[PDB]
């Protein structure tokens, strides 16, 4: 009876109608039963990758042994699993856990054949004694056959420490499946989440949600990473009962909420928003009429479901003269579609002038000094997969950082010394530049391919070159201007009254062109922020009372 | 009947370092 | 309180599964909240009898961590994390800050008379 | 005798029969035995490729030895394997004490074997080591052996380094053929005769990763392998061979074999389905690059020195994109380098690189540093009418001799390269006065060392068309994704046409013009509505654009 405690009996649960169905997958029951059915080094190991079904194939063991299915002597045997963390528990007066063992292991040489041993993770074997070296010669005797399931690295980490164990073993590879096998394992399973949850599935809605779970999330393998997305949609249809089925919009709304990647469906608010576009991005980046449409269509492409998944959404660079607004549109574009200036990655590699600066963006190889910590471009984006990526300045990088941005385009993973990939499939990076200065389109595209490397540039999208500024679009900036330090002033509750010679005094002068945009803001602050300063703190500008701005010849007068 | 005494350990991981190879500019 | 006075040989394992059988013995009750769960890792010297409680759906465990305690620890051993879900909890805006403040006031008054 | 149970042994495994065929490589058995006996030094080294068979090297002398052939003065030795993953710390030198404390507890001939001990090498064995009792016999990686053994040395100067070498092709055939009368145990077949040099040969060409003694072990045991389903025909065969190395590469089974006329009589309308146009120059070019495959001009020129010039905006690089895909079986194995900078004395030293301390050193040569690695490459050389009069000398031994040399010092090999020299003036005249400008541009003796001058033209009102198809074609393959279809319409088609020309770059519009109103404006239909899957898209034309 020295077993009747320590460990349940697992064939019996098979037996009460329990276990899942596990229709598919037949070929490495048949090839365990051929390795098993030999005279001598019987004592197979179930050894993959974590989560592509090792349970499934014991249990599938059991359902065929249950149903008598099997060859001749396989007939009516008994698979016991021991636990080892109930057999250690009350173990404490010198001798006890050694002789228990034992014990156990004398009960295991009682019956022959009928008893088959299937421990769980057999690494605990190896330690967890003060072990091994007493269940050792007992396995080449043929009295047990320790079936086990272990991961594919943790097996070459821990357990084949000691050589003398491998010849006590032998290895059977189980490979991730297919996505018609994965069809074949849903409409398999399509029985035991109906009666659990009260609810009835469209089979529509079975085939989108492994077809629309490959291009997403890549960390879990595909047995179970479509069942999860299934689940999650008849939970939600349950909580939405407290349309009475499950669809393919419930799947594209749960994998939209899940990892956080917001290219669900067409919701009826954001049609006009994505429609009526190119004049709300151009409430703060007035001007730049072909710049501004193309990267609207770019953004507008990816959402429609267009475009090859092999690739970011967009990857592309604009660059032109200084003070132009190259880098106040990258701003703006994250400003609606995150509503945060904040959630955006902006990097600058005008601080990587050197071959080992690459380590800071990519992380350190393994157990040097910062393996802890971990990377900067790469860490940031793997929690949330979907930020827009500026990179200012490409100009001053040493070209060793091209050879790490390179493998980003054109496949969408990017490695790292921590062993991991990360895939950039539907971010958006914007580069941006301030080469030559000198040219109109011929000698800056000139310096651009003198710049970079050949392909480089048919990988990316529109290479964009923007407009000088002109004396008509000068006056709208000194209303941004004016309505920036208007709202500025709302916290004592200041404002101003404008008049209009002023405000076009204001655009006559500053006007050096060569400078762009920046010299109007200095300008302005020259001329009113400080008269206003100056009068502010010596009383008479006591709050609440506005002041209105007049003209007196080169000054402003308040 | 038995104790464990669990015991401490000490743990190496060194640093490497980069050298600049200058150019002579002509 | 689990590791206190567990100097033995076999003490920390035996309570460890007193409590799993006080979890077990209801029948879908109790929900454990155990904050902080990178310590769940080692504690041992142990502490791998979780997996098939938490592998048959019968241990219901909502936990909370950091985020790079999450990376230093439990994507190092990648065969526990499958048995866990990630509910990516971000930061608020200043007006949901302003939201919040409007309801955390009475208590700041009661505790100080102002 | 107590570490037997912990380590190996191929001693008493010896005389078991355990042990394979030992054919050929009869000499390497000589030198470590030469080595072996001295008075020093007595500690070889197998440096050589891996997956070559060192390890039958050491089998073959222990059944040298079980036999006696060596001198009595190595009578009766006793070799054990030496297990290398029973230690990987707390074990990576706990097990090895008492495993050297047994070796020291011999006084006699327990001489050792370590494989790939490069991993294992730090000085904790050197005072044993030579104080003389033990052999060390070794094997290891070439490129390893420059990595640890130079700098964690601390006994370097006690080894020999014997090198094992890559077999030939007919003594590759011995040792497969010596191997044959194993595999009637694990699979069972009739051994076909003829199938064991066809699948050397085969696996001669594509496998690069794998080695040719194991290379042809990839091979036959593989193909009994999948043999297996059909006793679920006793005989293997040449298609045994091909469904396994076509169905491992990707690649389709026409060219199974004859690389010499069968792909080289297909240099013909299959350049029609890549390029569009010109019909006399694919046939000068298919005549010109055949006539280097012969063998009858010297050994060291480029395989093909022809150029050609005319208009932009042809076909003019997309010949050379058509010919490297197929000839040289790779899609990004051009070099497009452009000298539209050279006017300087200071401008042609980019092309070759700098001195070792200078400027550009790291970077190394425009051209030569992307030729050294995959030197199967075609090279074109854009715009050479404006370059200064310092290139030429350059470019000419470069079409003179097959050699030139870098900025290090090293020697790079044009021997089976093309080079295409293009241009763009002419295009106006015929053929008359574009010729006398290219006499007048270059010296007339530059000209007598190429090859054809051939000729390219405008194209065709209706046989522009065809491009257009082929880029709705490269269009539809996108948008699979919704699963639809366009229906194209030749007005619209023809409209493209006309509009797309633009008699300065040639046919450049497209690539972005199929992009702007067709995609923009279906972009539009599909995120607001009136458009679903399954549907078949009309175009055509009203008045101005192209209406949907
Ligand atoms: N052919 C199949 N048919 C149905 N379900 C399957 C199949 N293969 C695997 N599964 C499911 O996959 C899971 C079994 O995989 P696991 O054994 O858990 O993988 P694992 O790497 O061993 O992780 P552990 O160690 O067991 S926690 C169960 O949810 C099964 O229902
Ligand atoms: N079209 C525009 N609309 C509104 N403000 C503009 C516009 N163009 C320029 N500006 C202003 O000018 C400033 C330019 O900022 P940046 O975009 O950083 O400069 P830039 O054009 O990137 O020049 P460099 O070379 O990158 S420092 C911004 O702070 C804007 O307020
Ligand atoms: N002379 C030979 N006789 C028999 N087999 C050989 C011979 N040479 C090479 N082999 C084959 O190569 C294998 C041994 O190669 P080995 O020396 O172990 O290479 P590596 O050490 O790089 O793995 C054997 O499995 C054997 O079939
Ligand atoms: N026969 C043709 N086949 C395919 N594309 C063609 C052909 N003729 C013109 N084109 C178009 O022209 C482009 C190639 O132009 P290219 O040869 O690079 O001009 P350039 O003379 O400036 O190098 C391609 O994008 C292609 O669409």
Same mark, same amino acid.
């Given at each position: 009876?020295?077993?009747?405690?320590?460990?349940?009996?697992?064939?019996?649960?098979?037996?009460?109608?329990?276990?899942?169905?596990?229709?598919?997958?037949?070929?490495?029951?048949?090839?365990?039963?051929?390795?098993?059915?030999?005279?001598?080094?019987?004592?197979?190991?179930?050894?993959?990758?974590?989560?592509?079904?090792?349970?499934?194939?014991?249990?599938?063991?059991?359902?065929?042994?249950?149903?008598?299915?099997?060859?001749?002597?396989?007939?009516?045997?008994?698979?016991?699993?021991?636990?080892?963390?109930?057999?250690?528990?009350?173990?404490?007066?010198?001798?006890?856990?050694?002789?228990?063992?034992?014990?156990?292991?004398?009960?295991?040489?009682?019956?022959?054949?009928?008893?088959?041993?299937?421990?769980?993770?057999?690494?605990?074997?190896?330690?967890?004694?003060?072990?091994?070296?007493?269940?050792?010669?007992?396995?080449?005797?043929?009295?047990?056959?320790?079936?086990?399931?272990?991961?594919?690295?943790?097996?070459?980490?821990?357990?084949?420490?000691?050589?003398?164990?491998?010849?006590?073993?032998?290895?059977?590879?189980?490979?991730?499946?297919?996505?018609?096998?994965?069809?074949?394992?849903?409409?398999?399973?399509?029985?035991?989440?109906?009666?659990?949850?009260?609810?009835?599935?469209?089979?529509?809605?079975?085939?989108?949600?492994?077809?629309?779970?490959?291009?997403?999330?890549?960390?879990?393998?595909?047995?179970?990473?479509?069942?999860?997305?299934?689940?999650?949609?008849?939970?939600?249809?349950?909580?939405?009962?407290?349309?009475?089925?499950?669809?393919?919009?419930?799947?594209?709304?749960?994998?939209?909420?899940?990892?956080?990647?917001?290219?669900?469906? =067409?919701?009826?608010?954001?049609?006009?928003?994505?429609?009526?576009?190119?004049?709300?991005?151009?409430?703060?980046?007035?001007?730049?009429?072909?710049?501004?449409?193309?990267?609207?269509?770019?953004?507008?492409?990816?959402?429609?479901?267009?475009?090859?998944?092999?690739?970011?959404?967009?990857?592309?660079?604009?660059?032109?003269?200084?003070?132009?607004?190259?880098?106040? =549109?990258?701003?703006?574009?994250?400003?609606?579609?995150?509503?945060?200036?904040?959630?955006?990655?902006?990097?600058?590699?005008?601080?990587?002038?050197?071959?080992?600066?690459?380590?800071?963006?990519?992380?350190?190889?393994?157990?040097?000094?910062?393996?802890?910590?971990?990377?900067?471009?790469?860490?940031?984006?793997?929690?949330?997969?979907?930020?827009?990526?500026?990179?200012?300045?490409?100009?001053?990088?040493?070209?060793?950082?091209?050879?790490?941005?390179?493998?980003? =385009?054109?496949?969408?993973? =990017?490695?790292?010394?921590?062993?991991?990939?990360?895939?950039?499939?539907?971010?958006?990076?914007?580069?941006?530049?301030?080469?030559?200065?000198?040219?109109?389109?011929?000698?800056?595209?000139?310096?651009?391919?003198?710049?970079?490397?050949?392909?480089?540039?048919?990988?990316?999208?529109?290479?964009?070159?923007?407009?000088?500024?002109?004396?008509?679009?000068?006056?709208?900036?000194?209303?941004?201007?004016?309505?920036?330090?208007?709202?500025?002033?709302?916290?004592?509750?200041?404002?101003?009254?404008?008049?209009?010679?002023?405000?076009?005094?204001?655009?006559?002068?500053?006007?050096?062109?060569?400078?762009?945009?920046?010299?109007?803001?200095?300008?302005?602050?020259?001329?009113?922020?400080?008269?206003?300063?100056?009068?502010?703190?010596?009383?008479?500008?006591?709050?609440?009372?506005?002041?209105?701005?007049?003209?007196?010849?080169?000054?402003?007068?308040? | 009947?038995?104790?464990?005494?669990?015991?401490?350990?000490?743990?190496?991981?060194?640093?490497?370092?980069?050298?600049?190879?200058?150019?002579?500019?002509?």
């Amino acid at each position: 009876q020295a077993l009747q405690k320590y460990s349940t009996d697992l064939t019996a649960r098979a037996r009460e109608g329990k276990l899942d169905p596990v229709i598919g997958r037949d070929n490495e029951i048949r090839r365990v039963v051929q390795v098993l059915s030999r005279r001598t080094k019987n004592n197979p190991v179930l050894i993959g990758e974590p989560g592509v079904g090792k349970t499934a194939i014991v249990e599938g063991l059991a359902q065929r042994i249950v149903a008598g299915d099997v060859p001749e002597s396989l007939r009516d045997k008994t698979i016991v699993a021991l636990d080892l963390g109930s057999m250690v528990a009350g173990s404490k007066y010198r001798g006890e856990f050694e002789e228990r063992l034992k014990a156990v292991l004398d009960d295991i040489k009682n019956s022959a054949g009928q008893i088959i041993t299937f421990i769980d993770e057999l690494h605990t074997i190896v330690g967890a004694g003060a072990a091994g070296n007493m269940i050792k010669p007992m396995l080449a005797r043929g009295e047990l056959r320790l079936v086990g399931a272990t991961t594919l690295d943790e097996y070459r980490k821990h357990i084949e420490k000691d050589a003398a164990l491998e010849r006590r073993f032998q290895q059977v590879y189980v490979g991730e499946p297919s996505v018609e096998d994965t069809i074949g394992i849903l409409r398999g399973l399509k029985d035991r989440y109906e009666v659990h949850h009260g609810v009835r599935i469209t089979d529509s809605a079975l085939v989108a949600a492994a077809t629309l779970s490959d291009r997403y999330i890549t960390a879990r393998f595909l047995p179970d990473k479509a069942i999860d997305l299934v689940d999650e949609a008849a939970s939600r249809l349950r909580m939405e009962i407290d349309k009475e089925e499950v669809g393919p919009d419930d799947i594209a709304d749960v994998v939209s909420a899940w990892t956080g990647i917001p290219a669900g469906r =067409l919701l009826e608010g954001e049609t006009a928003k994505l429609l009526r576009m190119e004049d709300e991005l151009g409430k703060r980046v007035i001007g730049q009429k072909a710049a501004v449409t193309a990267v609207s269509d770019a953004v507008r492409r990816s959402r429609a479901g267009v475009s090859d998944p092999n690739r970011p959404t967009g990857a592309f660079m604009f660059l032109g003269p200084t003070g132009v607004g190259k880098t106040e =549109l990258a701003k703006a574009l994250a400003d609606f579609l995150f509503d945060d200036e904040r959630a955006m990655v902006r990097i600058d590699m005008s601080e990587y002038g050197e071959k080992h600066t690459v380590a800071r963006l990519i992380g350190a190889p393994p157990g040097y000094v910062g393996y802890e910590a971990g990377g900067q471009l790469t860490e940031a984006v793997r929690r949330r997969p979907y930020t827009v990526v500026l990179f200012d300045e490409i100009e001053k990088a040493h070209p060793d950082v091209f050879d790490v941005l390179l493998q980003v =385009l054109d496949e969408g993973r =990017l490695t790292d010394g921590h062993g991991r990939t990360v895939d950039f499939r539907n971010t958006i990076l914007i580069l941006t530049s301030n080469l030559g200065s000198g040219g109109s389109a011929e000698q800056v595209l000139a310096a651009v391919r003198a710049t970079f490397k050949p392909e480089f540039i048919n990988r990316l999208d529109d290479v964009l070159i923007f407009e000088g500024l002109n004396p008509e679009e000068l006056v709208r900036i000194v209303d941004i201007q004016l309505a920036q330090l208007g709202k500025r002033l709302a916290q004592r509750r200041l404002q101003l009254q404008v008049s209009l010679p002023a405000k076009r005094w204001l655009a006559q002068r500053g006007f050096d062109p060569v400078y762009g945009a920046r010299p109007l803001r200095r300008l302005v602050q020259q001329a009113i922020g400080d008269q206003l300063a100056k009068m502010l703190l010596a009383g008479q500008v006591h709050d609440g009372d506005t002041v209105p701005v007049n003209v007196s010849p080169d000054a402003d007068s308040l | 009947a038995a104790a464990a005494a669990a015991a401490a350990a000490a743990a190496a991981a060194a640093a490497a370092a980069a050298a600049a190879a200058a150019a002579a500019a002509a």
